[PDB]
Amino acid sequence: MESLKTDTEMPYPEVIVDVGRVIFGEENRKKMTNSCLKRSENSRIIRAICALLNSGGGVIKAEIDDKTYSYQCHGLGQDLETSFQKLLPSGSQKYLDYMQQGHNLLIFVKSWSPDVFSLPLRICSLRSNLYRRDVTSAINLSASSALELLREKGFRAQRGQEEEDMRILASEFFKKDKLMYKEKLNFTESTHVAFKRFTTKKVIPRIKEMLPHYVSAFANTQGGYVLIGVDDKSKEVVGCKWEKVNPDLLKKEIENCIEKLPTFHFCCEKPKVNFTTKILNVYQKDVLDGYVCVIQVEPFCCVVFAEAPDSWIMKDNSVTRLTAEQWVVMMLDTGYPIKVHKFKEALQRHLFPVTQEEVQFKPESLCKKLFSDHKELEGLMKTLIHPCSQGIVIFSRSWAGDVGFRKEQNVLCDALLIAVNSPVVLYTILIDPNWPGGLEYARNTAHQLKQKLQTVGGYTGKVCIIPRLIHLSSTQSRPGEIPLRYPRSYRLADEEEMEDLLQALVVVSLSSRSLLSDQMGCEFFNLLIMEQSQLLSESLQKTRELFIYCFPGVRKTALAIKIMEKIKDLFHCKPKEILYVCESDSLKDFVTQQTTCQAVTRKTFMQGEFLKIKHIVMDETENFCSKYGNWYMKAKNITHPKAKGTGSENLHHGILWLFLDPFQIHHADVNGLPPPSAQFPRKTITSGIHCALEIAKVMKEEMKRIKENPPSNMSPDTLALFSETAYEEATSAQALPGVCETKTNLTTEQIANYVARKCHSLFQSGYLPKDIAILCRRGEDRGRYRLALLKAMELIETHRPSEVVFSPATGVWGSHIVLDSIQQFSGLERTVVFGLSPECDQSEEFHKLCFASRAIKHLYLLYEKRAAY
Amino acid sequence: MESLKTDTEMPYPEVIVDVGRVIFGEENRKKMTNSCLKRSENSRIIRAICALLNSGGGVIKAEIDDKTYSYQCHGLGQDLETSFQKLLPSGSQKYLDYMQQGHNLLIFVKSWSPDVFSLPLRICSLRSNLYRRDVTSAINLSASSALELLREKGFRAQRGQEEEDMRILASEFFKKDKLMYKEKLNFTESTHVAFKRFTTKKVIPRIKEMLPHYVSAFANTQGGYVLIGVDDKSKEVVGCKWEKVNPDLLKKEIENCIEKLPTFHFCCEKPKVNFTTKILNVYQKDVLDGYVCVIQVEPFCCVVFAEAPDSWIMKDNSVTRLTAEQWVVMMLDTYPIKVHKFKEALQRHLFPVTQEEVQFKPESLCKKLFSDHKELEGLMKTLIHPCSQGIVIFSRSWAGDVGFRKEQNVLCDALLIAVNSPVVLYTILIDPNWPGGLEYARNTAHQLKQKLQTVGGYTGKVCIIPRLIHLSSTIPLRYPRSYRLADEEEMEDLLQALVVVSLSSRSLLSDQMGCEFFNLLIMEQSQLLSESLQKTRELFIYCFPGVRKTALAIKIMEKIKDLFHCKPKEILYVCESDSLKDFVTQQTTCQAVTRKTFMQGEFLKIKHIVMDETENFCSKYGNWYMKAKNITHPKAKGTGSENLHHGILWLFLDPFQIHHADVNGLPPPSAQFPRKTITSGIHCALEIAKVMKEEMKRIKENPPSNMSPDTLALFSETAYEEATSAQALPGVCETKTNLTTEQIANYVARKCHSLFQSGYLPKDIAILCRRGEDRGRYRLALLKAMELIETHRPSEVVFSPATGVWGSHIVLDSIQQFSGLERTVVFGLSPECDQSEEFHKLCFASRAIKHLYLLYEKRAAY
Ligand SMILES: [Zn+2]
Ligand SMILES: [Zn+2]
């Protein structure tokens, strides 16, 4: 199966299992003469249901034999119901919904999501086929008891009396060499002896049919003796006729049966199941009559199966039985960030609120682009949605691409309608209605989206995504008829169900690469920064001077802003009494807009005099230069004032927090800081990493390269505090899927064309120009790159709606693309970063870190060709 | 039941139920003519099993009808086995063991401990009696499914289609006002309609019997209609004869039945179950023939029971059914964890399983008992034989050690734990003619097993066999072989359970394992605190009362030596008292001096300084802080030092226990940064911590002159409660008031004698007096009291100054001389104190680990 299988009559998104012709109805089921057909049909239906439960859900199609059968009047069938109850002890309503359309009965099977309150039963099984022996009975363990036994045996392996009277009597019987006719047994059945239903006219068939059960029961429990040749009622040694079957054939059949038994091993030794078969002779008046067989099974280290556990899955459009190995692996279960599942409720409440207002079109950016490019989309969608007042329509250029699958050019956009008391509907808009593959695209996209919701999102409920195909060129909406019918239980019923589906959509979007993924990632990062700021603020009451060491990608500035707010709250000071000192002007304007507290650059700080400043927070401390003056003593004097006699009854100490990034030092001169031995007390922050996995991986590779061959300016002691293990833990905890690409050996025109094409593609998907940052290492190439980019974007944008405007790094907050040097972009970040740098050898490759620290989710490093002289 | 009930014939420790005469055996069970007796006997046995499972375990005693019945030859019974396997789906062998002695068949029922791999099914139940309607069938939910439904409804309440076609047709049938004879229904049964087995000759008994099931099924699920008067096979409105029963009587019976139904509510509104009963008339050719009753049940917010859930417990020597409220509370469930974290290490250190000869524990009590009674060693060696591997744990009173009464006539109790042996509890009696020995042994064994299962968390079959012995002298209790310990792992698990039980009680063994537990906890805190060595160089550590600063300081010194690779003599400890100096000098290899020695001397090779008792430092000699800074923070001298180093200056501060009114010499509280507040260092009894918290509140409410508001601000009672709950252990704190000197001496002598008889060594007693000039008077009075009490007088009573804390003698010194040192038992002898001077309870309590006896002398008369 590449995508799905074609079914014109019932083009459902889900997988369809055809169980052939079945007889349905209580009266018809009872009056069936053929019991074999009854059992076969029941088995087919139950196997299909189990496979659909373990394979994500689906539809079962059955051709109804009687042409006068109505589900409302007749019913389903009693035996099928007993089977359903056996398979689903919790309840069959939560998973199975029935429907009669035409002459076909459709059973809708929900995916087996283990109930949070219930035991974590990963998969559903009819019978474990793991037998454990209670007193005088061998019980086919249920799924829950099977999990009990598996977990107990696993713990035992990983770690490293009248019952005994029955065992002793059975052992004494075993040791005996010969027996007498009508000799009376002095013991009955127990946990360690079983002899009932074992004597027949033909012993071989009964042994083959029944021995596996008792052998599994004895091996799983402790000990056991199986006796063949003892009459059930009278407990005498009747024996088996010698002429009927010789002892050697019976012994070989027994060893064959025990060898065919499936087994699963928790331990390393992996012993086979061991058993001793001893054949006893019975003599009436010293003439041979027959023989009695005793089988002894010792306790077995792990679980032994009577046969393959009859649990089914779906594999290659077919219902497939699960082997013991597969069953135990799937049952014992022997990684998207947890923070997503912690914050999905707040994210849904912020971005996708369930309100009684009119229908909302999201996301705003893509909606604006689509509606400006196509004027009829607003009207067409408003007409199609009607009648619906409450709901959200989530637009995407390609939902299939949004869930990780192929993107189709012929699909203009996809709309996902979520509403209360309505099914989820996926609208696919086509540029040309004559495109043959629209229906397949819609069906596959709906199937993939539902599967992603259930698997990644964690949705545990009945949801139907109905593929509806629409065209802009059509003057009249809803052409033809839509025959897709689902039970009323599959539409969302309350606002809580809508909230749950939207939270699952939040998780799915945050686990993928898309425009919506990027926007919700920004909101997620805001929440994470709030949590980190709250955690770090606890040091305000315990320290006054602190040296904060930050890994690459920590986002020091947001933490600094929120820490400044926390200082204002805690110390009850006026906002203008807190000073933020940075090195770059651009960061100064950024912070000036983001915070009400005072923000100055180092030159202003040294030139000016700050009498009213009570607390100082310094960022970009690595790049500070001491040529103008020694700023550290100034900050110390403003923060730590020496006592002047008795004038100050209670001298105060302020906050002198310095944020340092040892890795990104671009000033070879001395910083003016105290030596690394005097940089105490210190804190290392690793949990601020807010970027893509790809960008974090690039930054870690550069970190390792720097640590292996440290440069002159950096020192071993500062490099020692940063470990790769902590960086992996933080990245796995806090990073989101993204894009990082590298291109080499390109001319200026090729770089310009690549940037123009990528920007056009991103804009078509709903990215705004404020998310694009084009950064060049060498500042003298700004004009050349600007001319090349103007030419490229003019060529690409043939329609040319508005002029292309690039803004300097000062205008980060504005709505324009940023084209400036890396030095001018220090401390500032944007979602998409284009790094235009000349050809770099191994020595100069360290600037990948500088480029990556500026990118949040996209990073396109482009390298120019070597100049020819 | 005060302790237990007397059973001379079967004196088992456990609770015994008598299920009367029962017929046993497959042949006998099958051939029974009377089915009512069969059902009654099966019900009695299963109810007793359920009660024993939910009530800690016990024994079932059944008298066998047949005198020729042998369990091995015959068996137990098929119906009984099926009932057992119904009650225990996991397995009946783990909980039920059978045994035949005499004419009685005994069933040994283990306590229902929910398996760690299991769903948390707290109690066992035959039937939930909670019904959930699958389509066409109403199912009595199992215990697990009942728990699932209860949790779902609780979460829902706390938070705040052809099936639909069936419902619509049923609603249309409901709305109809008239019916025709042999009118064919156009619908069959679904999740929302049920009418099978409802039409009988006498409708009322069948309704009374079956209606609760369907009402519960409909209420628990969504909606439902019940139809009365429809023939099963042909689906036509046969109707109920009008003469047989009037509609009003049937309606009132339905209302009575529905009202009688038990219910449990997860919500505050508490609505009753709502339902509409409508009576429909059937006419054949317009003449009345009968009537049809339709009952509508709407979805109901909470769970509705068909009847009281048949789960039983034990209450007042009786098998008692559980009501719905009790069952739901017990099923939904609506001591420090560090004990369960450290019990394995504690048992490996203190009760190791080895192939060596049997070990007698604890050593102190064993020495006392064997010295006082010479024959006890030989008697125990004889009784234990044949046994090589095992531990014998001695107690003056195991009953007292598990919280129950102490008996004077019991010399001691020995608990024998061994592999391939039952646990045996030996009670030694001074006078063998004491009537109550057997009852004492039985009750003690019962209480010890119950404590093990409940507090200790033991999940396994254990038998504690009461055995009574007498020193002056020159058993029918039979348990299944599964009740004896089988492996070394089972012995280890039982020993871990015993460790938890004793750490959850008050005894000598409790105190010794408390000391080991506190050592492990201090190791964990020291490891956690040592992380600040890499992040800070000068630190001001603020400690709540009872933090045990000195042990943390010693382990921090060790961590400094490990981290900075410095010689032990390069790390310096500065304290104020000579006694703590000597203590630390013995406990550590690093240099330890007092403040006077620190200021007089010169320390060239010292690279790191750790200071304790910093609140009591006096600046009259000079500025010790500046000296510490100069030693730890050296100013650069030109280019001589290529890489200047900064040392560690860690100051341990206790703001509450400031006894020097003069300025400490510390920097002002605004310059005391960076700072750390240690809360998780509290290692004492709950009672001592409570006294310290009360004194803390009293001090915070009325702060004295020397302390400052900023210093008191960091100490909150929420943190103190969290710490005390996390890391404190049960203990004793007592206060006596208005006693004269000889009464105080007699009290101390009597308490010391009682503690010594229980195995306490003299090194665990510290007698501390607030006023130092009373030391001689108290010493004379205590010597007189102790010589009067110890009539035997084996050895002289020796009191040691506070310098000799490490020695094996009672300490009699002032509180000032005992600063920074602790002992298990502390006696506080102080004069009468008013509200202003009550603050010294904190000083007295900081010196006690598990026992504190504050004694106040009478006011002096002039
Ligand atoms: Zn194995
Ligand atoms: Zn309620």
Residue numbers in the entry:
A (entry chain A): 1 to 160, 178 to 351, 378 to 912
B (entry chain B): 1 to 160, 178 to 351, 379 to 518, 525 to 912
Give verbatim lines from the article.
SLFN14 is another important member of the SLFN family (group III proteins containing RNase, SWAVDL, and helicase domains) that shares domain organization with SLFN11 and SLFN13. Herein, we carried out a systematic characterization of the enzymatic activities of human SLFN14, revealing that SLFN14 has RNase activity that cleaves RNAs containing double‐strand regions. By determining cryogenic electron microscopy (cryo‐EM) structures of SLFN14 apoenzyme and SLNF14 bound to a short hairpin RNA, we demonstrate that SLFN14 assembles into a ring‐like homodimer, and that an RNA‐binding groove formed by the two SLFN14‐NTD domains can accommodate a short hairpin RNA of ∼12 bp. The SLFN14 RNase domain is followed by a linker domain (366‐571 aa) and a superfamily I helicase domain (572‐912 aa).
To reveal the structural details underpinning the function of SLFN14, we determined the cryo‐EM structures of the full‐length human SLFN14 apoenzyme. Because wild‐type (WT) SLFN14 protein was not suitable for single‐particle analysis, primarily because it strongly aggregated on the cryo‐EM grid, we introduced four mutations, i.e., E211A, C365S, C775S, and C808S into SLFN14 (denoted SLFN14mut) to circumvent this problem. SLFN14mut was more stable and soluble, which allowed us to perform 3D reconstruction of the sample using ≈0.96 million particles, yielding an interpretable EM density map with an overall resolution of 2.84 Å that was suitable for model building. The cryo‐EM structure of apo SLFN14mut features a dimer with an overall fold similar to that of the SLFN11 dimer. Specifically, two intertwined SLFN14 monomers are organized with C2 symmetry, forming a ring‐like architecture. This ring‐like architecture of SLFN14 is composed of two copies of SWAGDV motif and helicase domain forming the body of the ring and two copies of N‐terminal RNase domains organized head‐to‐tail, forming a central RNA binding groove on top of the ring. SLFN14 harbors a zinc‐finger module located at the C‐lobe of the RNase domain, where a zinc ion is coordinated by residues C318, C319, H282, and C284. Using software PISA (Proteins, Interfaces, Structures and Assemblies), we calculated the dimer interfacial area for SLFN14 as 2807Å2 (ΔG = −17.9 kcal mol−1), which is larger than that of SLFN11 dimer interfacial area, 1848Å2 (ΔG = −1.1 kcal mol−1). Additionally, the ID‐helix in SLFN14 blocks access to the ATP‐binding pocket, as observed previously for the autoinhibited ATPase conformation observed in SLFN11. By contrast, in the SLFN14 apoenzyme structure, K213, R214, and F215 on Loop 211–220 are shifted away from the active site, suggesting the SLFN14 apoenzyme structure may represent the RNase inactive state of the enzyme.
